[PDB]
C-alpha cells in the first residue's frame, strides 16, 4: 500500500515545495491576470489557486481542461497574461492540448520533467512523488509552492514553511481518531462542506472519497447545501463541515443535519461546540495557507473508509494513473 | 403538480416572451454583469453568465452565500449590473446579498416580492409553481433573460413560437422516458454536458436529487474520466447531453458501457454513438439550444421519483423557500 504512506509525507512535501519556490522565485514573475488549467484533482487545485489569486488582489480564473478546449467562449477568461497548467504526471493529454492552443506565457506545475514541462516556458517541479493513482500530498505540496511564489511576486512577506509543515503534522495526529470514526459509524454516503478557499478543499475531499472508496460523496459551498441538496442526508450520512471561523449559521446548519438523523464531523480552527458528533481542531494559519492542514484530514478519512470496504485506494477500479486520448 | 408544471413549459416560453417585450426598452443590459442565486437559481445564474460571455459580454456567477461571506475569493471585479435570481423572490440569502449591493439591480422572479421591492427593475415571469421543485420557471426565466440580452447587445430576437414548439417536441418523449425508468432500474446517475449544457447537467442532477432522493452527479462532459467515472457500473445510467458530438463522445460512451453502465444520449444529432437510449431534440440558435433539454431531464427525474413511491412535489426535509 502506498496511499497512506504518501498522505503521511505531507509535512515533507511542504519542505520540498519551499525549496522549489526559493530556487525559482527570481526566475518567474506572476502577473495580475492568470488562467489556471487542470483536470480532476488538478482542476480543484486550479480553482483553489485562482481563489487565492483573487484573495491577494489579482484576477484568477480556473477551468477544467476540456472546457477550455471545447467551450472557452462560455467562460469569463478575458485577457490572459499567464496560463498555468497543473498536472501531477505532466502527461495528461488534455492539458497538453490546452496549452498548445495558448500563445501567452505558460507555467507548468508537476512532480517531474515531462511532456508538460517541455512545452512550458518554466515550471514548478515539486518532487512530491506518488505511486498511488489517487493524488494526495502532491496537491498540498503544489499549492504551497505556488502560494509562496504568488506572495513573493505580489510583494508580500514569505510564509513560514516550518510552521505550516508542523501544522500538517498536527493533522496527522488525528489518524487514530479518524480511523475510529470510520470503524464506529458505517456511513453510506457523505457530504463535504466548505466556503471560500475551503470549498475547493471540499470538492477535492469528495473526489478522494469517490476514487478511494468508490463512494457516494458530494461537496458544496457551506450554505448552498440547504437548497435541495440536503434532501439526501439522513441517519446513514456523515456530514463534514470545514470552517475556519464559525458563526451562528454554522451551529444552525449542524443541528439541521442532526435533525435529519445525520452525524456531523466539524473540522475547524475553532474550539467552539456547534453541536457536532465528531470534532477535529487544526492550527490556524495565515488565511491563504490555512486550508493546508485540512487536506491530510480528508485524505485519511477517505483512505480508512476505503480499507473498511476492502478496496485498494492505490488502484481504484476503472481508473488509469494518467488520462490520455 | 410537478408534472403539470413541467408540461407548462411551452406556455412558459410564450409568457417569457411577453415579459421581455414589456421591459426591453426600460433596461439595457451592460457588458459586465454579476449573477447571484441559490440552488437551481445558482445553476441558472451560471447559465446566464455563460451565455453573456458567449455573446461578447463578461458574466460572473456566484452562489448567494459565497457572495455574502467569501466574495474576496471570487473574480467579481467591477460590476455594471447585479442580477438576483429567485423563483420565490423571498430567499433570505438573495435578499441579504442584494441589500449590500449599491450598483444597479435586476431581479428575475415569478412574482412581486421582497426581491422586486429591492431591485431597480425586474423580470417577473409568471411561470407559477406549487411544487417545491423548480421546473418550467427555470426554462422560462432563461428565455426571458436571453431575449433581453440579445436585444441589449444588438442581436436579432429569437422566435418564441419556434422555441415553444421545440419544447412541445421534448414533451413527446414522455412515455419513452417512462419506459427508460421502467426498463432499467438504475441506482445512481451521472449527467454530462459542456458549455451551456454543463449548467443544465447541474440542474438535471439537482432535479433527480430533490425529486427522487437519489445519488445523482453532474460534470463537464470529459472531466468525468478524471476519477469521477469510478462510481459508474452496471447500476448506473449515464446521460450525455451534446449538441454536436465528435469522436471523443463515441469513445466516452463506449468507455462507460465497458464499465457496465447504460447510456442515454440527448442530442441535436442523428449520430449513433453506441448509446442504449436516444433522445433527439430540435436544434436551435446556439444560445437557445439548451432549452428543449430541460423538460427532458425534469421528466426523467419525475418518473424516477414516482417509481420509487416518492412525492416530487414535497421532497423530505425541503422547504419551498429557504429562509434564515
CATH number of the domain that residue A298 is part of: 3.40.50.10490
* C-alpha to C-alpha distance for B237 and B218, rounded to whole angstroms: 12
With beta carbons under 8 A apart, name residues in chain A contacting B95. Answer: none
CB B18 within 8 A of CB B160: no
**Neighbour tally for A91: CB within 10 Å:** 17
Report the 3 state secondary structure along B149-218. Answer: HHHHCCCCCCCHHHHHHHHHHHHCCHHHHHHHHHHCCCCEEEEEECCCHHHHHHHHHHHHHHHHCCEEEE
- Cα nearest neighbour of A37 on chain B: B223
**Is the same domain home to A89 and A202?**
no
**Is the same domain home to A294 and A241?**
yes
**Is the same domain home to B199 and B135?**
no
Grid cell digits, residue B283: 436544434
What phi-psi label fits residue B135: left (phi over 0), alpha (psi between -120 and 50 degrees) or beta? alpha
- Cα nearest neighbour of B256 on chain A: A318
* C-alpha to C-alpha distance for B212 and B313, rounded to whole angstroms: 11
**Is the same domain home to B137 and B286?**
no
* C-alpha to C-alpha distance for B265 and A225, rounded to whole angstroms: 29
Query: Reduced to 3 states, what is the DSSP secondary structure of residue A4?
Result: helix
**Is the same domain home to A193 and A107?**
no
Residue A324 resides in a domain: no
Grid cell digits, residue B18: 411577453
Rg (CA), chain A: 19
User: Alpha helices, DSSP H only, in chain B?
Assistant: 2-6, 9-23, 40-54, 64-70, 92-99, 114-118, 136-152, 160-171, 174-183, 197-212, 247-258, 293-307
Q: Is B235 a catalytic site residue?
A: no
Burial B285-302 (b: 16+ CB within 10 A, else e): eebbbbbbbbbbbbbbbb
Residue with cell 500500500: A1
Grid cell digits, residue A309: 470496504
Q: How far is B11 from chain A (nearest CA, A)?
A: 26
**Is the same domain home to B154 and B169?**
no
Please report, for residues A58, A74, A92, A236, A305, the alpha-carbon distance to residue A216 in angstroms, rounded to integers and kept in the order given.
Answer: 36, 30, 26, 11, 12
Chain-chain contact of A231 with B251 (C-beta, under 8 angstroms):
no
Residue that is last in its domain, among B158, B176, B191: B158
DSSP assignment of A83-127 equals EEEE-SSS--HHHHHHHHT--S-EEEEESSS-HHHHHSSEEEE--
**Is the same domain home to B153 and B167?**
no
Bridge pairing between strands A106-110 and A59-64: unpaired
* C-alpha to C-alpha distance for A297 and A174, rounded to whole angstroms: 7
**Is the same domain home to B140 and B99?**
yes
Residue that is last in its domain, among A137, A159, A181: A159
* C-alpha to C-alpha distance for B298 and A147, rounded to whole angstroms: 43
Beta carbon pairs, A and B, within 8 Å: 156
Grid cell digits, residue B74: 471570487
DSSP assignment of A184-215 equals H---SEEEEEE-TTHHHHHHHHHHHHHHHH--
Residue A322 resides in a domain: no
Among the listed residues B143, B36, B16, the one whose alpha carbon sits nearest the alpha carbon of residue B91? B36
* C-alpha to C-alpha distance for B24 and B16, rounded to whole angstroms: 12
Q: Which helix (H) or strand (E) holds B83?
A: strand B81-85
- Cα nearest neighbour of A245 on chain B: B69
Residue A325 resides in a domain: no
The beta-carbon neighbor of A317 closest among B58, B230, B248 is B230
* C-alpha to C-alpha distance for A282 and A171, rounded to whole angstroms: 7
The beta-carbon neighbor of B322 closest among A59, A197, A227 is A227
* C-alpha to C-alpha distance for A258 and A233, rounded to whole angstroms: 9
The number of distinct structural domains making up chain A is 2
Domain range for residue A261? 160-311
Query: Reduced to 3 states, what is the DSSP secondary structure of residue A135?
Result: coil
With beta carbons under 8 A apart, name residues in chain A contacting B290. Answer: none
Residue B320 resides in a domain: no
**Is the same domain home to A51 and A153?**
yes
Residue A129 resides in a domain: yes
Among the listed residues B158, B224, B59, the one whose alpha carbon sits nearest the alpha carbon of residue A318? B224
Name the structure determination technique: X-ray
Chain-chain contact of B227 with A76 (C-beta, under 8 angstroms):
no
Chain-chain contact of A74 with B230 (C-beta, under 8 angstroms):
no
**Neighbour tally for A170: CB within 10 Å:** 14
Residue with cell 431581479: B107
Of A227, A234, A322, which to mutate for an interface test with B (greatest number of B Cβ within 10 Å)? A227
Residue that is last in its domain, among A142, A159, A176: A159
* C-alpha to C-alpha distance for A85 and A102, rounded to whole angstroms: 11
Residue A319 resides in a domain: no
Chain-chain contact of A319 with B230 (C-beta, under 8 angstroms):
yes
Farthest CA pair distance, chain B: 55
The beta-carbon neighbor of B53 closest among A52, A73, A325 is A73
**Is the same domain home to B148 and B199?**
no
* C-alpha to C-alpha distance for A303 and A209, rounded to whole angstroms: 8
Q: How far is A160 from chain B (nearest CA, A)?
A: 22
Residue A100 resides in a domain: yes
**Is the same domain home to B154 and B164?**
no
**Is the same domain home to A184 and A304?**
yes
The beta-carbon neighbor of B231 closest among A54, A67, A214 is A214
What phi-psi label fits residue B274: left (phi over 0), alpha (psi between -120 and 50 degrees) or beta? left
Residue B316 resides in a domain: no
Amino acid at each position: 500500500m502506498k496511499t497512506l504512506i504518501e498522505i503521511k509525507q505531507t509535512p515533507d512535501g511542504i519542505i520540498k515545495a519551499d525549496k522549489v519556490f526559493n530556487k525559482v522565485k527570481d526566475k518567474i514573475s506572476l502577473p495580475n491576470r492568470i488562467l489556471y488549467l487542470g483536470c480532476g484533482s488538478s482542476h480543484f487545485l486550479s480553482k483553489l489557486l485562482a481563489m487565492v489569486t483573487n484573495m491577494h488582489g489579482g484576477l484568477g480564473i480556473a477551468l477544467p481542461c476540456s472546457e477550455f478546449l471545447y467551450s472557452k467562449e462560455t467562460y469569463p477568461i478575458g485577457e490572459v497574461e499567464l496560463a498555468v497548467g497543473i498536472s501531477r504526471s505532466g502527461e495528461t493529454t488534455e492539458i497538453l492540448l490546452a496549452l498548445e492552443k495558448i500563445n501567452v506565457k505558460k507555467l507548468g506545475i508537476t512532480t517531474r520533467e515531462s511532456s508538460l514541462t517541455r512545452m512550458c516556458d518554466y515550471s514548478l517541479v515539486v518532487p512530491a512523488i506518488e505511486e498511488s493513482v489517487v493524488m494526495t500530498h502532491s496537491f498540498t505540496s503544489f499549492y504551497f509552492a505556488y502560494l509562496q511564489l504568488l506572495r513573493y511576486s505580489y510583494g508580500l512577506p514569505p510564509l513560514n514553511a516550518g510552521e505550516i509543515s508542523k501544522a500538517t503534522e498536527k493533522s496527522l495526529e488525528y489518524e487514530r481518531y479518524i480511523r475510529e470514526i470510520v470503524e464506529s459509524f458505517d456511513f453510506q454516503n457523505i457530504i463535504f462542506l466548505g466556503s471560500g478557499l475551503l470549498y475547493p478543499v471540499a470538492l477535492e475531499a469528495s473526489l478522494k472519497m469517490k476514487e478511494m472508496s468508490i463512494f457516494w460523496s458530494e461537496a458544496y459551498p457551506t450554505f448552498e447545501v440547504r437548497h435541495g441538496f440536503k434532501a439526501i442526508a439522513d441517519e446513514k450520512t456523515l456530514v463534514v463541515l470545514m470552517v475556519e471561523e464559525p458563526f451562528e449559521w454554522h451551529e444552525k446548519l449542524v443541528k439541521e443535519f442532526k435533525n435529519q438523523g445525520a452525524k456531523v464531523l466539524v473540522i475547524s480552527n475553532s474550539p467552539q461546540d456547534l453541536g457536532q458528533d465528531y470534532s477535529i481542531e487544526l492550527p490556524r494559519l495565515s488565511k491563504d495557507a490555512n486550508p493546508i492542514p485540512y487536506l491530510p484530514i480528508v485524505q485519511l478519512l477517505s483512505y480508512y473508509k476505503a480499507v473498511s470496504r476492502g478496496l485498494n485506494p492505490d488502484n481504484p477500479r476503472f481508473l488509469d494513473k494518467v488520462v490520455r486520448w
